[PDB]
Design an enzyme around this catalytic site. Structure first.
Site, PDB file in Angstrom:
ATOM      1  N   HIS A  16       0.812  -1.210   0.000  1.00  0.00           N
ATOM      2  CA  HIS A  16       0.000   0.000   0.000  1.00  0.00           C
ATOM      3  C   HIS A  16       0.854   1.272   0.000  1.00  0.00           C
ATOM      4  CE1 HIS A  16      -3.415   2.542   1.850  1.00  0.00           C
ATOM      5  NE2 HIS A  16      -3.774   2.222   0.621  1.00  0.00           N
ATOM      6  N   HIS A  59      -1.638  10.242  -2.880  1.00  0.00           N
ATOM      7  CA  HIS A  59      -2.956   9.792  -2.469  1.00  0.00           C
ATOM      8  C   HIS A  59      -4.050  10.851  -2.519  1.00  0.00           C
ATOM      9  CE1 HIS A  59      -5.839   7.148  -0.545  1.00  0.00           C
ATOM     10  NE2 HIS A  59      -6.213   8.201   0.161  1.00  0.00           N
TER      11      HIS A  59
HETATM   12 NA    NA Z   1      -5.040   3.453  -3.137  1.00  0.00          NA
END
Ligand code: NA
Length: 267
Positions: A16, A59
Site C-alpha cells: 500500500h 494519495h
Molecule cells: Na489506493
C-alpha cells in the site's frame, strides 16, 4: 475451481503506497523499501495529475498532508511540485520510523516509477473519476505501453492491475483494452449494499474486487470467490486480521507492512 492471482502466487502482498508504514508513502524511498528490501508482490500507486498534465503518485488531491506545500496537485506544475518536500512530514508524524534521508524526498511521476522498477516489477495503479482528471486513463495506458507493460505476456502474468472506485473509469479502460486486469474498489459498507446482479456485471469488466477488509466475512468472501473474483481487501496492518482473512480465502491484501503479511504467509 476458484481464481488465483495472475502472478501465480497463492497470497499476493500489495505494498500500500510502497513501504508506507516505514517510509513516506509514494516516494522512491517507500517503493525501494517494499520492492527491494521487503520484496512485496506489488508496488501500489495512487495517481494525481499536475497543472501541466503529468501523472504523479500521491494519495490526496492536495499536497497539504504529505508535503511542505499547500494546494491542489493540479495547481502545481511538475516542476513546482518537484520543489516540495514529500518526506519530512513522515518523520514528524511517525517519530519512531523517522529517518534523516527522508527529508526532501520528492513526489514521483508515474513515468519515473515505471522507469525505475522496470518491466519486471508488478504495479497496482489507481485511477479517479473520468471527470476529475479527463484523459487520465488514456494517459495511464499510454505510459504503461511506453514501458512495455502492455505486452500480453506481461498482462497475463499480473504485472499490471488497474484499480478504481469508479466503475466508469474501469469500464472506459476495459473498452479501450480488454486485456488489462481491472480491480473494482468497494467502499466501506458498500460491499453489502450490492446484490448478485451487481456483482455479475462488475465481474464482466473486472477480474478483481477490493473491498474494505472490515466488510469481509468467511461467507461473503467465499461467495465472491465463487463468482470468479480475486479478492484483495484493503489496508490490513494487523497480523491477526491477516491470518483471519487468509483463512476466509482472500488472495492477498493491501498493507502498510509488507513483512508482517509475508510472515503471516510463511506460517
Ligand atoms: Na489506493
Amino acid at each position: 475451481q476458484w481464481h488465483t492471482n495472475l502472478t501465480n502466487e497463492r497470497f499476493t502482498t500489495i505494498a500500500h503506497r510502497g513501504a508506507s508504514g516505514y517510509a513516506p508513502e509514494h516516494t522512491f524511498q517507500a517503493y525501494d523499501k517494499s520492492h527491494n528490501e521487503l520484496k512485496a508482490s506489488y508496488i501500489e500507486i495512487d495517481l494525481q495529475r499536475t497543472k501541466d498534465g503529468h501523472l504523479v503518485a500521491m494519495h490526496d488531491e492536495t499536497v497539504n498532508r504529505t508535503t511542505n506545500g499547500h494546494g491542489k496537485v493540479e495547481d502545481y506544475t511538475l516542476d513546482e511540485l518537484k520543489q516540495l518536500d514529500a518526506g519530512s512530514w513522515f518523520n514528524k508524524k511517525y517519530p519512531k520510523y523517522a529517518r534523516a534521508s527522508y527529508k526532501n524526498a520528492k513526489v514521483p511521476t508515474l513515468d519515473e516509477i515505471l522507469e525505475r522498477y522496470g518491466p519486471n516489477a508488478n504495479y497496482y495503479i489507481e485511477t479517479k473519476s473520468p471527470d476529475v482528471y479527463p484523459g487520465m486513463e488514456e494517459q495511464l495506458l499510454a505510459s504503461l505501453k511506453k514501458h512495455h507493460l502492455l505486452n500480453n505476456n506481461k498482462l497475463k502474468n499480473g504485472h499490471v492491475m488497474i484499480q478504481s472506485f469508479s466503475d466508469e473509469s474501469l469500464k472506459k479502460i476495459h473498452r479501450q483494452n480488454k486485456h488489462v486486469p481491472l480491480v473494482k474498489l468497494v467502499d466501506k459498507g458498500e460491499l453489502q449494499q450490492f446484490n448478485d446482479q451487481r456483482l455479475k456485471e462488475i465481474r464482466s469488466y473486472a477480474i478483481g474486487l477490493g473491498p474494505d477488509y472490515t466488510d469481509l466475512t468467511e461467507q461473503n468472501t467465499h461467495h465472491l470467490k465463487d463468482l470468479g473474483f480475486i479478492v484483495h481487501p484493503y489496508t490490513v496492518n494487523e497480523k491477526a486480521d491477516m491470518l483471519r482473512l487468509n483463512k476466509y480465502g482472500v488472495d492477498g491484501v493491501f498493507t502498510n507492512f509488507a513483512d508482517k503479511y509475508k510472515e503471516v504467509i510463511k506460517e
